[PDB]
Amino acid sequence: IVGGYTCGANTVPYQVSLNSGYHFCGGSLINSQWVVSAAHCYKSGIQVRLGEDNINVVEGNEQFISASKSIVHPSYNSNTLNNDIMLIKLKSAASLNSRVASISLPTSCASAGTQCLISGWGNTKSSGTSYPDVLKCLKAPILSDSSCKSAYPGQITSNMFCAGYLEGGKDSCQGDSGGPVVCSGKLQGIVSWGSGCAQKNKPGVYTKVCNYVSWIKQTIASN
């Protein structure tokens, strides 16, 4: 997250860190046994770490659970990143408490202008590399589809939306991938892609979760 602030320990209790020996992507807890992340974050051997703040220090509120199965969207396209969403089932159910909570799926899609909260342990420099150990947050509005499409001509589909600032400065970035974009208490997006991080007129692009709710509900009920 570039141009954001330290969230505060466990103030984003549905945020998850996907670990394969190190943190490589974020995700969101949607119920005690399931996590939603981005399909471009797919790996074999994922351990889900819940209740995290500093990912390099065990502070006492974490739950480390291995994944039993991963399901990448049937129509995920790795070249265009269309349908960039994946579901991960936990081997054991997580214990929900104040520090570990699930986030709600949307009943409808959010409007341009709506303010959202984006979080993650991804890079914090636009021109440089600095990976934080504690969770970073960023409040950003959903942009209009026309500014999103003018920034990325022929690359935005109906399953994506842009959020951020065209002036540059604040954006999600590599490492934040798969993490949550929560607006009005619902999970509306998944950190997916962008052009570099925080560059002017190159806002972040997110998976539009409201288009996948029936696929999510049907898939977790049958697995």
174 makes contact, choosing from Ca ion, Mg ion, Zn ion, none, with CB < 5 to 8 Å by partner type, with: Zn ion
- Helices then strands (H, E): number in the chain? 2, 13
Residue with tokens 């330290």: 6
DSSP state of 15: E
Q: How many CB atoms lie within 10 A of CB 104?
A: 12
The answer to whether residue 177 is catalytic is yes
φ/ψ (deg, to 5) at 219: -65, -45
Is 40 or 49 the residue whose CB approaches Zn ion more closely?
A: 40
Residue 168, contacted partner among ligand BAK, Mg ion, Zn ion, none, CB below 5-8 A by kind: none
Query: Does the annotation place 177 within a ligand binding site?
Result: yes
Tell me whether strands 115-120 and 47-50 are parallel, antiparallel or unpaired: unpaired
Q: Which one of ligand BAK, Ca ion, Zn ion, none is in contact with 197 (Cβ closer than 5 to 8 A by kind)?
A: ligand BAK
Mark whether 40 is an active-site residue.
yes
Residues 108 and 183 sit within 8 Å (Cβ to Cβ): no
Span of 71-79, 111-119, 168-176, 204-212 interacting with Zn ion by CB under 5 A: 168-176
Cβ-contact 56, 134 below 8 angstroms: no
Q: Counting contacts by CB under 5 A, is residue 62 touching Mg ion? A: no
Residue stretches of the annotated binding site:
52, 54, 57, 62, 171-172, 174-175, 177
Site for Ca ion, rule CB under 5 A: 52, 54, 57, 59
Residue stretches of the annotated binding site for substrate:
171-172, 174-175, 177
Q: Which residues are catalytic?
A: 40, 84, 177
